[PDB]
A paper describes a structure:
Clostridial collagenases are among the most efficient enzymes to degrade by far the most predominant protein in the biosphere. Clostridia employ collagenases for nutrition (e.g. saprophytic strains) and host colonization (1–3). They are large multidomain proteins of ∼115 kDa belonging to the gluzincin superfamily of metalloproteases. Here we present the crystal structures of the peptidase domains of ColH and ColT and the collagenase unit of ColG in the presence and absence of the peptidic inhibitor isoamylphosphonyl-Gly-Pro-Ala bound to the active site.
Although the previously reported ColG crystals contained the PKD-like domain in addition to the collagenase unit, the PKD-like domain remained largely disordered. This disorder is presumably related to the presence of citrate in the crystallization buffer, which titrates away Ca2+ ions. Because the crystal packing did not tolerate rebuffering to introduce calcium, we produced and crystallized an isolated PKD-like domain spanning residues Asn795–Asn880 to investigate its calcium-binding properties. To verify the proposed calcium binding site in the PKD-like domain, the crystal structure of an N-terminally extended construct of the PKD-like domain of ColG (Asn795–Asn880) was determined in the presence of 10 mm calcium at 0.99 Å resolution. In this orthorhombic crystal form, we identified six proteinaceous ligands, namely Asn795, Lys796, Asp825, Asp864, and both of the carboxylate oxygens of Asp823, which together with a seventh water ligand coordinate the calcium ion in a pentagonal-bipyramidal geometry. In addition, an N-terminally further extended PKD construct (Ile792–Asn880) was crystallized in the same conditions as the Asn795–Asn880, but the additional residues (Ile792, Ser793, and Asn794) could not be traced in the electron density, indicating their flexibility even in the presence of calcium (data not shown). Notably, in both PKD variants (Ile792–Asn880 and Asn795–Asn880), the calcium could not be extracted by incubating the respective crystals for up to 4 h with 100 mm EDTA.
Numbering used by the authors: 795 to 880
């Protein structure tokens, strides 16, 4: 098996209190299927889904982590920086 490769699409800037839409659908497993897309939004919040949403309560800079898992259980991550403005 080869582990998958995580790819996040979504905004790199958003605004406080607004729902930010993220996707992991461009992630790729060369030899199988991605079976889960886990998100850590950098403010303690987590979600799961090929698409996910999060609103940040405070302006600042956050690193979002996407963790993809393939059909064999191998994992990969991406760290993606988002700026949240007032
Ligand atoms: Ca694989």
């Amino acid at each position: 098996n080869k582990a998958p490769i995580a790819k996040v699409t979504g905004p790199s800037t958003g605004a406080v209190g607004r729902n930010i839409e993220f996707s992991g659908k461009d992630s790729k497993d060369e030899d199988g299927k991605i079976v889960s897309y886990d998100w850590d939004f950098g403010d303690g919040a987590t979600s799961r889904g090929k698409n996910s949403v999060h609103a940040y309560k405070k302006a600042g800079t956050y690193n979002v982590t996407l963790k993809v898992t393939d059909d064999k259980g191998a994992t990969a991550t991406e760290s993606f920086t988002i700026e949240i403005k007032n």
